[PDB]
Amino acid sequence: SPAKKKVIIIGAGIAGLKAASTLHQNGIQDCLVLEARDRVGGRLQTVTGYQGRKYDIGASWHHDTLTNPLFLEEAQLSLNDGRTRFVFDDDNFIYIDEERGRVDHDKELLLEIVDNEMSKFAELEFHQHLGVSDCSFFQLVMKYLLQRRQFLTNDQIRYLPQLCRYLELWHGLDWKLLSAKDTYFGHQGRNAFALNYDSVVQRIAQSFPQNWLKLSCEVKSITREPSKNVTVNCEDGTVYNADYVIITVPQSVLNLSVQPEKNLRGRIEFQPPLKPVIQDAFDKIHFGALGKVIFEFEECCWSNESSKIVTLANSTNEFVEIVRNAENLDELDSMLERETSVTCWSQPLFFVNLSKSTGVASFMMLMQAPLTNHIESIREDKERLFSFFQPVLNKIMKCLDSEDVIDGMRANKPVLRNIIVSNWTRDPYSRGAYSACFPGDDPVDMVVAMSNGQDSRIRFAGEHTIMDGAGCAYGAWESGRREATRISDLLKLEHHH
Amino acid sequence: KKKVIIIGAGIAGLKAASTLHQNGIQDCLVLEARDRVGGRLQTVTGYQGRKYDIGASWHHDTLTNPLFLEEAQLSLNDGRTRFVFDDDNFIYIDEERGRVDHDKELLLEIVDNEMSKFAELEFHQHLCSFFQLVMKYLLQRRQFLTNDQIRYLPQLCRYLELWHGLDWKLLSAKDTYFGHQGRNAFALNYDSVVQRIAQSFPQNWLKLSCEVKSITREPSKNVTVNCEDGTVYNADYVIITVPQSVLNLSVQPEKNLRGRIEFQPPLKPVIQDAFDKIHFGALGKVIFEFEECCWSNESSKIVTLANSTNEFVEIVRNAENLDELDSMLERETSVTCWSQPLFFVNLSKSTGVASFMMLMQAPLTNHIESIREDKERLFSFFQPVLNKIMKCLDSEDVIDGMRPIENIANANKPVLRNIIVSNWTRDPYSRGAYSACFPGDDPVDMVVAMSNGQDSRIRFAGEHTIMDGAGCAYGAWESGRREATRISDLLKLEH
Ligand SMILES: Cc1cc2nc3c(=O)[nH]c(=O)nc-3n(C[C@H](O)[C@H](O)[C@H](O)COP(=O)(O)OP(=O)(O)OC[C@H]3O[C@@H](n4cnc5c(N)ncnc54)[C@H](O)[C@@H]3O)c2cc1C
Ligand SMILES: Cc1cc2nc3c(=O)[nH]c(=O)nc-3n(C[C@H](O)[C@H](O)[C@H](O)COP(=O)(O)OP(=O)(O)OC[C@H]3O[C@@H](n4cnc5c(N)ncnc54)[C@H](O)[C@@H]3O)c2cc1C
Ligand SMILES: C[C@H](CCNCCCCN)NC(=O)c1ccccc1
Numbered sequence: 001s002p003a004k005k006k007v008i009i010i011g012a013g014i015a016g017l018k019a020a021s022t023l024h025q026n027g028i029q030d031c032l033v034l035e036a037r038d039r040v041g042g043r044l045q046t047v048t049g050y051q052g053r054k055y056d057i058g059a060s061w062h063h064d065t066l067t068n069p070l071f072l073e074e075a076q077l078s079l080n081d082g083r084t085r086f087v088f089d090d091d092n093f094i095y096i097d098e099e100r101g102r103v104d105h106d107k108e109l110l111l112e113i114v115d116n117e118m119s120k121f122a123e124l125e126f127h128q129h130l131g132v133s134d135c136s137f138f139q140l141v142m143k144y145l146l147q148r149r150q151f152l153t154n155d156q157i158r159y160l161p162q163l164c165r166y167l168e169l170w171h172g173l174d175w176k177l178l179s180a181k182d183t184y185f186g187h188q189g190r191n192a193f194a195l196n197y198d199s200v201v202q203r204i205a206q207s208f209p210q211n212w213l214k215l216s217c218e219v220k221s222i223t224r225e226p227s228k229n230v231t232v233n234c235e236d237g238t239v240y241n242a243d244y245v246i247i248t249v250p251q252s253v254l255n256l257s258v259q260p261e262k263n264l265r266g267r268i269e270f271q272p273p274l275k276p277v278i279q280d281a282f283d284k285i286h287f288g289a290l291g292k293v294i295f296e297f298e299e300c301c302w303s304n305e306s307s308k309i310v311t312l313a314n315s316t317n318e319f320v321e322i323v324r325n326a327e328n329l330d331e332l333d334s335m336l337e338r339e340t341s342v343t344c345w346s347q348p349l350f351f352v353n354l355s356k357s358t359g360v361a362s363f364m365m366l367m368q369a370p371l372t373n374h375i376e377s378i379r380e381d382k383e384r385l386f387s388f389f390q391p392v393l394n395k396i397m398k399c400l401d402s403e404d405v406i407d408g409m410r411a412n413k414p415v416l417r418n419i420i421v422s423n424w425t426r427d428p429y430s431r432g433a434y435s436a437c438f439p440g441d442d443p444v445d446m447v448v449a450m451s452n453g454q455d456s457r458i459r460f461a462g463e464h465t466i467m468d469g470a471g472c473a474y475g476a477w478e479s480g481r482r483e484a485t486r487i488s489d490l491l492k493l494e495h496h497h
Numbered sequence: 498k499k500k501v502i503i504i505g506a507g508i509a510g511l512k513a514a515s516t517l518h519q520n521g522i523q524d525c526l527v528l529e530a531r532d533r534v535g536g537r538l539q540t541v542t543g544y545q546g547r548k549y550d551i552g553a554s555w556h557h558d559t560l561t562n563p564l565f566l567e568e569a570q571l572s573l574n575d576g577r578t579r580f581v582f583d584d585d586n587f588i589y590i591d592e593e594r595g596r597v598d599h600d601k602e603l604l605l606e607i608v609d610n611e612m613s614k615f616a617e618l619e620f621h622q623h624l625c626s627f628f629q630l631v632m633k634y635l636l637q638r639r640q641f642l643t644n645d646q647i648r649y650l651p652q653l654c655r656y657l658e659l660w661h662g663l664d665w666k667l668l669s670a671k672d673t674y675f676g677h678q679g680r681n682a683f684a685l686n687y688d689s690v691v692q693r694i695a696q697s698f699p700q701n702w703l704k705l706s707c708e709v710k711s712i713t714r715e716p717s718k719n720v721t722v723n724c725e726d727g728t729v730y731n732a733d734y735v736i737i738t739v740p741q742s743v744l745n746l747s748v749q750p751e752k753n754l755r756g757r758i759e760f761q762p763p764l765k766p767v768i769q770d771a772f773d774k775i776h777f778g779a780l781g782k783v784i785f786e787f788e789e790c791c792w793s794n795e796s797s798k799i800v801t802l803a804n805s806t807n808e809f810v811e812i813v814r815n816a817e818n819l820d821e822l823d824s825m826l827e828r829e830t831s832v833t834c835w836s837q838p839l840f841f842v843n844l845s846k847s848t849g850v851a852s853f854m855m856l857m858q859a860p861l862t863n864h865i866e867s868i869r870e871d872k873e874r875l876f877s878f879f880q881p882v883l884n885k886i887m888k889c890l891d892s893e894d895v896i897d898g899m900r901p902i903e904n905i906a907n908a909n910k911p912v913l914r915n916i917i918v919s920n921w922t923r924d925p926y927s928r929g930a931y932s933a934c935f936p937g938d939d940p941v942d943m944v945v946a947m948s949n950g951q952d953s954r955i956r957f958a959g960e961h962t963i964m965d966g967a968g969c970a971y972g973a974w975e976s977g978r979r980e981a982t983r984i985s986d987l988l989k990l991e992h
Contacts, residue, residue, distance in 0.1 A: 065641070066615060079640055088641055090607050092599055105586055105599055107795060113584050117679050121560060124678065150569055151559070151582055151680070188618065189611045190641070305601055 002239040007487055008232050009033045010219050010268070011248035013042030014070075014473050015461045017204045018480030019246045024208035026488040031209070032242070034234065036218040036266065036429050040205050043250070043430060044473060046198035050296040050418040053360055056197040057292055057422045059473045060352075060364070062086060066189030070474035074200060075192075085200075089193040089357035091306040094399070095163050098314060098345055098391075102399050103159055111163050114156055118144050118164055122184045132181070134439040137167065139333070140180040145323050146332060158320045162312035162348065168368040169310075169350040172288025172433045177369060182437040193357060197473070220262070221269040222247070222458060230457050244457045244490075246483045248476075251446065251464040252287050252431030265428030270454070278449040285446040285464070288436030288471075291372030293385070294420035295363040295393065301414050302400040304356035309400075311349045311392045344392040347371055351396060363393075372425055372433070379421030382409055386419060435464045435471045443470065451482075459483045501984055502526045502722060502730055504709050504758075505738030507536025508553075508970055509958040511694040513736045513977030518698035520985035525698070526730055528707035528722070530739075530756055530926050534695055537740070537927060538970065540688035544786040544915040547850050550687045551782050551919050553970045554842075554854065556580060560679030563978075564971040568682075568690065579689060580682040583847040585796040589653050590889050592804055592835050592881075597649055608646055609654045611638070616674045623671075626936045627657065630670040635813050636822050644810045652802040652838065659800075659840040659856040661933045662780030667859065669775070669934035683847055687970070694974075704728075710753075712737065712760045712955065720954045733988070734954055736980045738973075741943070741961035742928035745772045755925035764951060771943035776961070778933020781862030782919040783875070785853040785883065788912035792892035794846035801839045801882045834882040837861050841886060853886075855879075862922055862930070869918035872899050876916065887911060932961050932968040940967060948976075956980045 006028055009016040012035035020033045039045070043058040062071035065088075078085045095104035095111065103109050121144045126132055141161045149157065165175050167183055194200065205213070217234035222245060224230050230245045247254070249266065256267035258279040319336075326332035350366040367375055378384055386407050394404040397414050408415035424430045437443050450465035461479035469475030500522050503510040506529035514527045533539075537552045556565040559582075568579050589598040589605065597603050615634045631651045639647060660675075661668050684690065708725035712735065715721055721731040737744070739758065746757040748769050763769075816822030840856040857865060868874055876897055884894045898912040921927045934940060947962035958976040966972025 066611065066618060066638075075640065091601070091604065092607070107586075110585065113586070113680065117560065120676075120678055124560060148560075150573060186614070188614055190607065192641075 002231065002241045003032075005030055005032045005240055005242040006491070007031045007244045007246065007484070008230070008240055008242035009246045009248065010222075010232070011035060011042060011462070012037070012040035012205070012213065012215070013248055013462070013476060014044055014201065014204070015042075015463070015465075015476035015480040016246065016248040017041075017201065018477045019248070019461055019484040020212060020480075021204050021207045022481050022484035023488065024212075026485070028484075028488055028491060031212050032240065033213045034217045034219055034232065035213070035215050038216045040213065040215070041198055041201040043424070043434070044197045044201050046196055047420060049294060049362075049420050053296060053362060054196065055292075055294050055354075055362070055364060055420065056194060057294075057420065058424070059197050060194055061089075062192040062194060062474065063472050064188035064469065064474070065192050068188070068469070068472075068474045070200070070477045071192055077203075084195055086192040086194050087357060088190050089307050089352070090190045091308045091356070093166070094306045094309045095312060096309065096395060096399050097159060097162070097312045098395060100159070101395075103163070103312070108153075109155055109159060111156070111160060114152065114160050115164055117148075118160065119184055121148070122180065126181050134179050134181050134441075136176050136439050137178040137180045137183040138175040140183070141165075141175065142323075142332060143329060146326060146329060149323055154317070154320045154324075157323050158315045158317060159312065162315050163310070165313065165348040166310045166350060168348055169290065169366045171368070171436050172290035172372070173369050173436050173438070174347060174371075177438060179437040179439040179441050181439075182441065182443070193352075195358070218266070219268055221271065223271040224455065224458060228457070244459065244487045246459045246461050246480070246487070247454075248460070248462045248480070250430060250432070250462065251282075251285070251435055253429065254460075255282050258282060266431070270458075275449070275454060278454070281445040281449040284440075284442045286436055286438045286441060287432035288434055289369035289372040289425050290433035291367040291376055291424065292420075292422040293365045293367065293375065293389070294418075295365065295389070295416060296418040296420070297361040297363070297405075298408065298415045298417050300355045300359075300361045301412060302353075302355065302397055302402040304353065305400070307353045307355075307357040309351040309353055309396060311345070311351070311396065313347050314345045342371065342374070344389050349392060353400075363396075365389075372422075376421060376423055376425045379423065382419050385421065386416060451479075459487070499524045499526050499730060499732040500988060501734045501736060501981075502528065502720065502732035503736045503738065504528050504712070504722065505536065505740075505959070506531070506534035506703065506705070507738050507740075507959065507973065508538055508691070508694070509738035509960075509962075509973040509977035509980075510534075510536075510736065511691065511977070512974045513738065513958055513981040514702060515694045515697040516978045516981035517985055518702075520982065520989070522985050522988060525702050526732065527698075527703045528709050528724060528730070529703065529705045530708040532705055534703070534705070535688060535691040536738075537921070537931070538687045538691050540686055541917060543784060543852075543917050547786060547852060548686055548688070549782075549784050549852070549854060549917065550684060551784070551917065552921070553687050554684055555970075556682030556684055557969050557971070558678035558966065559682050562679075562682075562966065562969075562971040564690070564974045565682055568684075578685055580684050581847050582680050583683040583797045583842070584680045585798045585846070587656070588796045588799045588889070589656075589802055590799065590885055591649060591652070591802040592885060594649075595885075596889050597653070597802065603643075603645055603649065605646065605650055605653050608642065608650050612650070612654055613674050616670065620671050625670040626666050627655075627668040627670050627673040628665040629936075630673065631655075631665065632822060632826070633819065636816060636819060639813055644807075644814070647810045647813050648805050648807065649802065652805045653800075655803070655838045656800045656840060658838055658858045659780065661858075662778035662862065662930045663859050663933050663935075664837065667935060669936045669938050672934035672938065672940065683842075685848070708756065709739075709758055712758055714761075714952065714954050718954070734956065734984045736956050736958050736977070736984070738958045738977060740927060740959060741776050741932060743926060744957075745776070746928075748772060756928075760951065760955070767942075767946045767949075768951070771946050774938035774940070774943060775935030776932045776938070776943070777859070777935070778930055779859040779862045779922045780930035781857045781866055781921060782917075783855045783857065783865065783879070784915070784917040785855065785879070785913060786915040786917070787851040787853075787895075788898070788907070788914060790845040790849075790851040791909055791911050792843075792845065792887055793890035794843070795890070797843045797846040799841040799843055799886060801835065801841070801885065803837050804835045832861065832864070834879050839882055853883075862919075866918055866920055866922050869920060872916050875918065876913065883913070940964075948979075956983070 253266040352364040450460040453459040461483040463476040466479040842854040950956040960973040963976040
């Protein structure tokens with residue numbers, strides 16, 4: 001009765017999609033891709049807004065373009081058909097502070113130069129160091145400020161740590177939640193902003209039997225039959241038997257398995273239940289919440305000096321002094337505690353001025369946890385949002401040679417026609433943006449348990465199941481190629497005399 | 498009669514002696530060939546009494562630089578000014594185009610960074626010249642580079658030539674892109690440093706004008722050395738801090754070459770072989786002392802970009818591979834101030850003094866120094882880049898006032914008074930600037946062989962006997978503290 005399949009992939013993300021791609025590439029037949037949503041791509045979603053303009057509300061860039069297998073693949077096509085599939089939108093960051101204004105590439109602040117030293121500082125703190133406990137990124141930025149106060153001006157000690165935090169937007173975590181040992185990481189080359197990441201999702205989705213894909217099926221349970229087979233159940237009731245299965249649900253969704261309540265959207269009931277080595281890996285790795293807010297304006301009425309703009313939080317000169325007075329490290333850590341609402345200036349905000357990179361009059365901004373859940377929890381209040389960001393929006397426009405902004409959601413002035421927010425933290429099938437490390441996190445743990453699988457037939461792929469390009473789309477891609485290739489290798493023994 | 502005999506009065510010998518003395522060791526000799534200490538640390542005076550470090554000038558790796566810490570200590574202590582952090586946003590200038598730094602569309606700095614990462618990868622876990630490498634990158638990534646980026650980038654990234662004192666066709670790629678551990682500290686008089694160390698041990702220990710031309714280790718556990726003129730000396734241990742370049746003459750015929758020390762028996766094979774991994778780097782300097790400051794003080798760091806062509810881009814855009822792009826490169830010399838990248842430190846913004854401290858590289862260094870007496874020629878050679886810098890700095894063409902004629906018309910206009918050039922490549926006690934790598938060198942077998950001395954009596958120190966700060970000032974300083982303590986410990990333990 002239950003349909004016989006060779007390999008059943010759970011999840012139509014880039015990971016499962018690539019698994020499905022590789023499988024068909026290796027002549028594996030009768031396969032099946034089961035996806036809860038009614039769309040493929042998963043955390044690679046391209047939405048539409050005002051005038052029909054499009055933006056990736058999930059991944060946007062191809063990182064490490066020097067080694068990124070997925071990118072080079074995408075680059076090969078464009079190099080052969082001349083079609084624009086991306087664009088290196090790296091630029092010189094423009095740093096704005098509420099009071100001061102633009103403190104970037106400054107002759108007396110030299111902020112970027114001390115950031116690199118701050119970076120190297122961190123590097124010397126870890127990179128090749130056994131034992132060295134962790135501590136938050138915030139703590140680390142404080143330690144540097146303390147161990148080097150003798151060579152930092154009053155303005156550096158104040159404005160530096162704020163610029164330093166643009167990193168929060170790489171990780172999706174606030175500097176107090178972020179693990180230092182993991183804050184600083186190398187980038188293998190420039191970034192390539194994807195001109196339709198969904199453009200990539202589809203290429204891969206059309207590379208294998210279209211009947212393999214069955215959307216809107218939420219997998220409730222996965223069972224390994226003592227007879228060496230895996231049975232998968234969709235909520236709608238359909239049941240399938242398959243020799244192998246490649247599980248690609250988000251680390252967050254997979255985590256729902258180590259708990260009671262089999263009525264949590266997304267959760268899969270595992271029989272036998274996930275190995276103790278897996279669930280326990282969950283303790284040492286966590287989830288981040290990178291969030292996005294697209295600010296669509298009517299026309300490009302602002303300076304395109306750059307495409308990367310970050311607004312620094314707020315700093316106080318009393319801080320400078322505390323750093324100027326602290327006798328020891330703990331004293332500083334202590335003191336500061338001195339004890340209130342969150343506003344657009346309570347954390348760094350990363351704005352991507354698409355008007356220079358894509359010729360579109362919109363701003364793609366990145367937020368981090370905790371602001372993400374908050375902003376996402378109220379994405380439906382387009383007014384409470386415009387109210388929230390108006391100040392930074394104005395401040396930015398001020399520095400970009402333009403007047404304040406005119407809310408025109410429902411003429412040389414900038415008009416905000418529409419606002420789009422991400423829903424990753426609220427999406428039961430997503431539960432966050434992607435993998436991230438908290439202080440004391442051995443991300444190597446999850447990767448190992450994951451890349452090794454539940455057993456011979458219950459495997460794992462996804463941004464968390466791989467090390468190289470972990471958290472990145474291309475990592476999830478490679479993970480898909482991986483698990484499929486292995487399955488493909490095992491099935492190769494089939495045609496042996 | 499002497500406990501330790503230190504050969505060389507450089508930063509190495511001076512700390513090596515300082516340390517011995519700080520350890521209570523007596524009867525010591527410091528034998529220098531020159532009439533002064535400091536070695537490659539020499540301060541000189543020019544117009545209106547200004548002082549410039551014609552040799553070392555920066556505190557590198559100020560996060561781990563032991564010496565630098567020591568210096569900041571005193572500063573925190575006695576509030577004096579012993580240095581100024583001058584790392585500034587580099588201003589890149591092309592003859593034709595002008596400034597190209599921090600350009601909204603060229604974004605050279607960003608791609609220069611990919612270039613670095615590209616090199617790092619090219620060598621990560623590997624069993625080629627800096628030029629070969631830039632060409633590889635360009636060919637490999639041309640698909641994601643604009644024509645202008647391809648054109649200028651390579652010329653900009655060559656600022657690295659002034660880190661190694663070598664052109665990008667003679668420098669080893671595997672050693673081009675090292676990494677700096679923290680900001681740099683412009684030493685306000687590196688001589689103030691030479692003097693403090695210098696004064697920390699008994700003055701009557703120094704024997705200036707002693708060209709040690711032979712080191713011998715008598716069987717009966719004694720080390721005896723003789724200086725050119727005559728004076729023979731003997732010691733228990735002997736810290737040889739003469740630079741590599743000179744010590745490399747210890748393996749040739751006509752054993753007389755100035756500064757050439759001849760050991761007996763000779764320097765063991767593990768040492769001789771090390772001199773087969775280049776080290777002929779010649780970084781030179783040329784101070785341009787002006788009347789008064791009258792040019793934009795935007796940045797304290799500037800670099801002129803050797804001319805670049807558009808046919809270069811066309812060739813990169815059309816080459817089918819590393820082989821073709823290689824040959825297609827070459828055609829049809831005349832060396833001008835625009836035949837190489839030039840690094841100008843604008844001392845106006847960092848020190849107040851209306852002067853430019855310029856760094857040059859091999860093979861140019863050798864040329865410009867060999868004509869360091871002809872100020873007229875030196876002015877002609879540099880006038881063009883000097884004017885271009887002035888243009889780009891909200892100023893105007895430089896007036897040659899090296900043979901002065903006070904005139905009012907020189908209101909705003911900048912007036913060049915003096916010009917001071919290094920001589921490192923012609924000084925027999927130097928024979929270049931400092932360690933560098935030719936395509937194929939290996940900065941390890943020399944640092945190790947050297948740090949393992951000849952035997953227990955004959956030790957080596959300097960900027961070519963350590964891995965941390967190798968070739969750098971703090972490196973040598975440390976190599977000297979190293980050889981001393983290692984000896985002061987032995988002597989102490991001897992009952
Ligand atoms: C806001 C944001 C911005 C990002 N930006 C970048 C970037 O710029 N560059 C980059 O490289 N990466 C970026 N990433 C990360 C990148 O998007 C992910 O690493 C990648 O998309 C993960 O793909 P995946 O297949 O591993 O997981 P997913 O894309 O989440 O796919 C998992 C699939 O599982 C499905 N599913 C879950 N449970 C079930 C179930 N029980 N039954 C059936 N189906 C189920 C989900 O619907 C989903 O389709 C970003 C991520 C976010 C959230
Ligand atoms: C132009 C230039 C710029 C530089 N800038 C910097 C910088 O900014 N920052 C930095 O960290 N480093 C810099 N360096 C390198 C640094 O200055 C040197 O590595 C350092 O000075 C070496 O010190 P030393 O004691 O090891 O060698 P030396 O300074 O050469 O001392 C060795 C001594 O041995 C003497 N001697 C040689 N032969 C004999 C002999 N036969 N008998 C007796 N005595 C002899 C020599 O005269 C010399 O006095 C620069 C070098 C140059 C040339
Ligand atoms: C002392 C340093 C030379 C490089 N030293 C190499 C030793 C470090 C390798 N581990 N100075 C320079 O050439 C220089 C010149 C301009 C700006 C910065 C550095």
